[PDB]
Amino acid sequence: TFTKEDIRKFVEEENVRYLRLQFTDILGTIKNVEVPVSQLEKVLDNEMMFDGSSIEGFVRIEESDMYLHPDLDTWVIFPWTAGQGKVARLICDVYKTDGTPFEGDPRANLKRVLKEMEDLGFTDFNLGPEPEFFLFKLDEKGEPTLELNDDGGYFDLAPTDLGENCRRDIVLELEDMGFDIEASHHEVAPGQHEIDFKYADAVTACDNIQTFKLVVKTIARKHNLHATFMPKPLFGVNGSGMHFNVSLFKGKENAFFDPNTEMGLTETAYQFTAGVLKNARGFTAVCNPLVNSYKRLVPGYEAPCYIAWSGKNRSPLIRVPSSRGLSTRIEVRSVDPAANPYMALAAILEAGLDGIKNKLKVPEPVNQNIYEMNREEREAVGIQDLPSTLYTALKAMRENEVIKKALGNHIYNQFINSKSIEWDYYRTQVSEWERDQYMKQY
Amino acid sequence: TFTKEDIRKFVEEENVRYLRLQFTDILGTIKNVEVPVSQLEKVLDNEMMFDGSSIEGFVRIEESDMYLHPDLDTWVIFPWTAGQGKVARLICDVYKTDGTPFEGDPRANLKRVLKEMEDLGFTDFNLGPEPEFFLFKLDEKGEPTLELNDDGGYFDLAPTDLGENCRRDIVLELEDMGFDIEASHHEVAPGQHEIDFKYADAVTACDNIQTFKLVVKTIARKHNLHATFMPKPLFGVNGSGMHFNVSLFKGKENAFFDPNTEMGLTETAYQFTAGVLKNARGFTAVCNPLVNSYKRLVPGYEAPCYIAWSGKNRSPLIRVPSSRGLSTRIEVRSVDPAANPYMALAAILEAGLDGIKNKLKVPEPVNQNIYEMNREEREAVGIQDLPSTLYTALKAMRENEVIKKALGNHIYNQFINSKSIEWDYYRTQVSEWERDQYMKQY
Amino acid sequence: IARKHNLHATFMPKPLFGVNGSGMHFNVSLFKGKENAFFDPNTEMGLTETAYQFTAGVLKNARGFTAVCNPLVNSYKRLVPGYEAPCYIAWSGKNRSPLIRVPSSRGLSTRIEVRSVDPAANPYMALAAILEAGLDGIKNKLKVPEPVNQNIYEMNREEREAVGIQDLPSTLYTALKAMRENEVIKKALGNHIYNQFINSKSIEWDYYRTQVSEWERDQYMKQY
Ligand SMILES: Nc1ncnc2c1ncn2[C@@H]1O[C@H](COP(=O)(O)OP(=O)(O)O)[C@@H](O)[C@H]1O
Ligand SMILES: Nc1ncnc2c1ncn2[C@@H]1O[C@H](COP(=O)(O)OP(=O)(O)O)[C@@H](O)[C@H]1O
Ligand SMILES: C[S@](=O)(CC[C@H](N)C(=O)O)=NP(=O)(O)O
Ligand SMILES: C[S@](=O)(CC[C@H](N)C(=O)O)=NP(=O)(O)O
Ligand SMILES: C[S@](=O)(CC[C@H](N)C(=O)O)=NP(=O)(O)O
Ligand SMILES: [Mg+2]
Ligand SMILES: [Mg+2]
Ligand SMILES: [Mg+2]
Ligand SMILES: [Mg+2]
Ligand SMILES: [Mg+2]
Ligand SMILES: [Mg+2]
Ligand SMILES: [Mg+2]
Ligand SMILES: [Mg+2]
Ligand SMILES: [Mg+2]
């Protein structure tokens, strides 16, 4: 944890002339404002203010004044800004005029579930995300095209894979920002890319994801490309998800890892798996929040389709990578990169604690390709399906109690409400598909 | 009813040189073959044959030989063919190599329900359809555009309404074919048109609808236009439905019309209304068979949204026009022009007979604008909603028993099966809407 | 600079229909020499009665100074409801629908933010206007109507007439006439500036009154 004179010393020592205070609305979009260094004890005295009317999911126009309280632990400088315009950043939580934190701030809300988990004996909730993304070419006037940067596949090399330097450039700015980058490569789909980085505290992991996406889209544009984290932007090729590798620690204890078992898993980790499977239908709407999200949750693309766990398996909802030890984890593959990381985490966490709190029994693993399983054959072993559309996700959300717990009223309410207009709007448009499949035949 | 020497005399007297035998597959598409007059006792001896493998909804490639049995009552000549190439037409039912009628022929299937209704005391099942349609401009190479012929509205005149002569031309060919045309006008939406004609026997009414559409699309093309019966081809304007005005007759008895009641309805007509409301969810999938069909079953466009009846009302599922007397009818507004007329009729008929057979009690009428009714306020008076998507229509179909009765196994089965692939295919594509609403924001 | 970036900056009140207009909010205060004469540290509100008298001031005369603070025909396509621009004469704290908003900041930051002004206004005239409107409320010590602490856009005519909320002038012409009866504004600009602003803008209006929009041709030229 950093001091207030910690960051006072930092702005002198590096001559940081501008400060970007950041936070996150309900859809997971970074929102921020730049302030000259001149203003640094307004920001440090927490007297920074903004307008909640114009933030989706926050507040009404008559209740609109809101405050930013910076979190000094988040401090970081941008390795490409420098000189007369060197820029530094602080992520903030949102406070009301009360002086009290805002019930509707996704991030403070994660901090809230994390106390419900340190009350059950655990030090940290560690997350390692796998945010995949596509790269599209830009046109003369700087706007995206439907033309992917390459037509390469998994682990391909240049010139089959042309995102090489862009990913390199992304990595070095990320590296020069504090990330421990783990790997960088081309994923399965044409123009699809992956850059993995090391796990971190529940809150700082999401802080990481929201910075990750900021850097991907900014460098991508400099390379004359458009980066999208849209779950499934083209039909018939792999979508891109955000796999959430997750683990509880008892202070350098990997509490999921039993060191003499042959499969190497404690069963407080077994019970965790039980709760996320019990509540999977419940939280899908926050881990798959677009209508586009469900066009990626169809079989055949290494995306979770049915609710089940297995090891060394990319067909199921929950993989347990072969890696054990301090790296023993469960990878939750449903989440896609459009999900609000802070909220997706609170849902998965509380879903896993109501799995231990309730001492729940794990189901048996499906060590098969689930996509090759007959509907009746999978109904035989009793495996549920995930919601097939955002509407069905929504209604499964208002049935599940564990999710309202994880999100609270203001967020739970402002979410069902907003994602139901996006469904209404979408269930009125006429797709090129119908017109293309119906207007001449009928 | 006509004789075989009836039509022998007809081909001599007019010198009809070509014969078009017609029938209908499961999606309501006219299928036919032209035969020289040379072949007229092959056709009359029922020795005409074709291939059921290549007809959707019929039969397998190993069971493929099928026969046509013409229905001589249907005879009609085309008032635009003449001379060396004068053409005449006979609608046929499909028979197997058995000699027995094909279980899967929508039309013979209507004839089958009609015997289940003359066994309950009624002479005819009379239908008057209102098939609405749009007119799109063609381009240089003869292919449709998204440009409507006019930007007129209801009952408009030229030059605001430019479909005048086309509709005229349609009417005179229709008139010269035996239709008693009733009215012709521009309906609510831009480039939308209506041409009503007088009611007829259950079977000949559908025979009429399938000819209607044939003539609309043929004249429309000569006028350099493209006619579509797509339910909802553009968002934000009125779709076009096929209102089914329906009545039972006891031989010139309008059995729906009570002549001293003030509202003028017998209650064998009241019980009929009860059964179509009891089974509405069941048969929607056949009266609204496209995914496009449900983009028209959204509130605000004079299309049925919730299951309810009223009089003088275009907001509800079932209208009872002010017209009483020999014209007392219930108009069933859900049906849209993409529905197979023969099948839509069997569903609505059997739905209404299980309403009298079961002596069912009518509900109370909603004499209001149902679209202005709060969701909870309409849940208060207990009015169901129609299926919001073709998938929900399908599953409501496999629950309802009255519909499997109306369609039989081969048709019921071949329908759930085929319209579920069209849903699968459609619930995999990525709409310009998502890419347009998601690819830059995420 | 915007040009040096191949861009074009405009302070036009609402260059585009259907999205927020750009307004030039005037947060103002009165000082008695290093101390914010708007801020009472004892009371819970945070406001002295000079701040109350002062806003009673601008509220009372808002109709009169509106033409000067919203001086283009375009100005009045921003005073449409629903875009965080005001269109009713009212005041609230913490609230962005009303004419005057008073921010949560107190201490040396206590102030009234007059949301009416748009960036097309002549700052020295608008400020001269608001200052004397306030100065009127201070030397007649008017007492302030009670605040309107809801979204003032979602209120019906019946619901606003009840509480006594006057609209601001809908058009520039109507704003000019509001300007000719309000006498406090005439002393604010002086005879010379008052007259020539009125002239200049009266004839600006006449030119707009006679234009034919292609709004109109896109509606009436095929319909009628
Ligand atoms: N104990 C752990 N808890 C949480 N995350 C972990 C743990 N061990 C490793 N990880 C995370 O797993 C991720 C590895 O992802 P990746 O290498 O793409 O896996 P794979 O390719 O097998 O799916 C890293 O992001 C890292 O943070
Ligand atoms: N007794 C009846 N039974 C069945 N159909 C009828 C009866 N009387 C009239 N019709 C039909 O009603 C239709 C009238 O449709 P239309 O004039 O467009 O009605 P509206 O415009 O009021 O909806 C005709 O197609 C006609 O066949
Ligand atoms: C080869 S893949 O395994 C495919 C990811 C998939 N497109 C998804 O939607 O999660 N994922 P990874 O190697 O990143 O764990
Ligand atoms: C004015 S309308 O009443 C509108 C028909 C609507 N578009 C529908 O989908 O049925 N129908 P009609 O006058 O043909 O009975
Ligand atoms: C949310 S807004 O509050 C919008 C004001 C708008 N531009 C207008 O005055 O039309 N402005 P700000 O928070 O900068 O005061
Ligand atoms: Mg808002
Ligand atoms: Mg650098
Ligand atoms: Mg990986
Ligand atoms: Mg993974
Ligand atoms: Mg076939
Ligand atoms: Mg002719
Ligand atoms: Mg009509
Ligand atoms: Mg009708
Ligand atoms: Mg402001």
Numbering used by the authors:
A (entry chain E), B (entry chain E): 5 to 446
C (entry chain A): 223 to 446
Pull text from the paper.
In Gram-positive bacteria, nitrogen homeostasis is controlled by an operon encoding glutamine synthetase (GS), a dodecameric machine that assimilates ammonium into glutamine, and the GlnR repressor. GlnR detects nitrogen excess indirectly by binding glutamine-feedback-inhibited-GS (FBI-GS), which activates its transcription-repression function. GS generates glutamine from glutamate, ATP, and ammonium by a mechanism that involves the initial phosphorylation of the γ-carboxyl group of glutamate by ATP and the subsequent incorporation of ammonium. The structures show FBI-GS binds the GlnR C-terminal domain within its active-site cavity, juxtaposing two GlnR monomers to form a DNA-binding-competent GlnR dimer.
To visualize the active, transition state (TS) conformations of the GS proteins we reacted them with l-methionine-S-sulfoximine (MSO) in the presence of ATP and solved the structures. In these structures, the Met-Sox-P methyl group occupies the ammonium substrate binding site, thus mimicking the GS transition state and preventing further reaction. Structures of the Pp, Lm, and Sa GS-Met-Sox-P-ADP complexes were obtained to 1.98, 3.50, and 2.95 Å resolution, respectively. These structures were all dodecameric and densities for Met-Sox-P and ADP were clearly observed in each enzyme. The GS TS structures all display the same contacts to the Met-Sox-P and ADP. Strikingly, while the TS structures are similar to each other, they show significant differences, both global and local, when compared to the corresponding apo and FBI-GS-GlnR bound states (as apo and FBI-GS-GlnR conformations are the same, the state will be referred to as apo/FBI-GS-GlnR). The largest local structural changes between the GS TS and apo GS/FBI-GS-GlnR-bound states are within the active site loop regions (rmsd of apo GS/FBI-GS-GlnR versus Met-Sox-bound GS subunits is 2.0–2.5 Å for 400 corresponding Cα atoms), but the rmsds are 0.8 Å when the active site loops are not included. Moreover, superimposition of the TS dodecamer onto the apo GS or FBI-GS-GlnR bound oligomers (comparing Cα atoms of the dodecamers) results in rmsds of >3.0 Å, indicating that the catalytically induced structural changes are transmitted between subunits, causing significant alterations in the oligomeric structure. In the TS state, Asp62´ and Arg316 are repositioned to provide an optimal active site architecture. Thus, our structural analyses indicate that GS enzymes from low G + C Gram-positive bacteria adopt two distinct states, the active, TS conformation (herein termed the “A” state) and the conformation adopted by apo GS/FBI-GS-GlnR, termed the “I” or inhibited state.
